[PDB]
Amino acid sequence: PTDSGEKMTLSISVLLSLTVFLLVIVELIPST
C-alpha cells in the first residue's frame, strides 16, 4: 500500500532525523 513513496518518505522522515540526532550525539559526546 504505497500511493506515492509514503513508506519511503516516512523512512526518510524518521531515519534522517535519527541520523541528525545521531550527529548531534556525536557532537556532544566528545563534549561531555
From Swiss-Prot:
Transmembrane domains' residue ranges: 8-26
UniProt subcellular location: Postsynaptic cell membrane; Cell membrane
Domain of life, source organism: Eukaryota
Function per UniProt: Upon acetylcholine binding, the AChR responds by an extensive change in conformation that affects all subunits and leads to opening of an ion-conducting channel across the plasma membrane.
Subunit structure: Pentamer of two alpha chains, and one each of the beta, delta, and gamma chains.
Family, similarity comment: Belongs to the ligand-gated ion channel (TC 1.A.9) family. Acetylcholine receptor (TC 1.A.9.1) subfamily. Alpha-1/CHRNA1 sub-subfamily.
Protein name per its UniProtKB record: Acetylcholine receptor subunit alpha
Organism in which the protein naturally occurs: Tetronarce californica
Protein encoded by which gene: CHRNA1
